[PDB]
């Protein structure tokens, strides 16, 4: 189930959130498939971090991205995992 996901709209939505929608809607629809499933929701967030790690070449941009990423389930109307390592 995890291998099948298209999290590119989440990566697009987050980096535009850092610069300062079509992708916020599409991102929440993708994340909705993991609602109230903590292990699988965490892997989705981790895979967004994994793909974006090379592109965050600065402490302040990295922390804002992490912060916005931790708030992404809540801002989509979903529960975040109790624990999810983003390092």
């Amino acid at each position: 189930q995890l291998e099948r996901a298209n999290l590119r709209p989440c990566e697009q939505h987050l980096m535009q959130k850092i610069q300062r929608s079509q992708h916020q809607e599409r991102c929440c629809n993708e994340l909705n498939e993991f609602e109230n499933n903590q292990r699988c929701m965490c892997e989705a967030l981790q895979q967004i971090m994994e793909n974006q790690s090379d592109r965050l070449q600065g402490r302040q941009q990295e922390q804002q991205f992490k912060r916005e990423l931790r708030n992404l389930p809540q801002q989509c109307g979903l529960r975040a995992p109790q624990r999810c390592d983003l390092d």
Partner: antibody, heavy 116, light 110 residues
Framework: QLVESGGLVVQPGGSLRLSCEAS????????MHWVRQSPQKGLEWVSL????????EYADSVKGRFTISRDNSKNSLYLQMNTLRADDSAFYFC???????????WGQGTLVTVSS | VVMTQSPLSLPVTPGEPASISCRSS???????????LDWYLQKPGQSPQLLIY???KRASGVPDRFSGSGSGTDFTLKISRVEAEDVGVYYC????????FGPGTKVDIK
């Protein structure tokens, strides 16, 4: 400000260490790269170090021979170059990443001559 | 990833418009929306300075007459009206796989 030290004539197969003193911005918030400029060859990218120093990535050309390091205490990006070679001769630039993988502020330059 | 540029030499009439093209061997579109392409001006005697970054966005000190466009592999740096301090080697650079600069275009004063 990115004052760049080190860089002298070296023999083939030798070692050299470069330093880069930072001024004008929070050094502990930005990835730092080394990029070199050859006389004949174009602009080559060298190595990488995150602001925390946690990650370090290297160009294929000069990988295993060069090791990159930062001292956030003294605000200095070091490049320890070993096994220097004629192909490694170039002007070496201390590049200041912009936070989103772009070279915002460049240094002035320091030359390295691999010659006998 | 290999970066090429056309023209290798672009003599300009000052005041007139000018363009440089850059092309990559593979698409420069990342999984986020960004096109990881910059432009860098190396003037005579000076180090390279940032003109345009991430495809369209321009730098703080770079005035508005520097434009940057493109999508996929082809990218174009347009200039509205050429001026004094706009002469040197114009490298493009990708930031996708690692960091690869183009050979550069010389901005002669014709």
């Amino acid at each position: 400000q990115l004052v760049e030290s080190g860089g002298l004539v070296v023999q083939p197969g030798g070692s050299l260490r470069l330093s880069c003193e930072a001024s004008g911005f929070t050094f502990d918030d930005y990835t730092m790269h080394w990029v070199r400029q050859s006389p004949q060859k174009g602009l080559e990218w060298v190595s990488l170090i995150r602001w925390d120093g946690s990650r370090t990535e290297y160009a294929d050309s000069v990988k295993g021979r060069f090791t990159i390091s930062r001292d956030n205490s003294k605000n200095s990006l070091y490049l320890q170059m070993n096994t220097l070679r004629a192909d490694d001769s170039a002007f070496y630039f201390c590049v200041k990443d912009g936070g989103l993988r772009y070279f915002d502020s460049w240094g002035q330059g320091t030359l390295v001559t691999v010659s006998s | 990833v290999v970066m090429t540029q056309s023209p290798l030499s672009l003599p300009v009439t000052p005041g007139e418009p000018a363009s440089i093209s850059c092309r990559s061997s593979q698409s420069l579109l990342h999984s986020n929306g960004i096109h990881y392409l910059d432009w860098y001006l190396q003037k005579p005697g000076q180090s390279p300075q940032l003109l345009i970054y991430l495809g369209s966005k321009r730098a703080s000190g770079v005035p508005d007459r520097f434009s940057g466009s493109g999508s996929g592999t082809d990218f174009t740096l347009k200039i509205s009206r050429v001026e004094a301090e706009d002469v040197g080697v114009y490298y493009c650079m990708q930031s996708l796989q690692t960091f690869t600069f183009g050979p550069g275009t010389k901005v002669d004063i014709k």
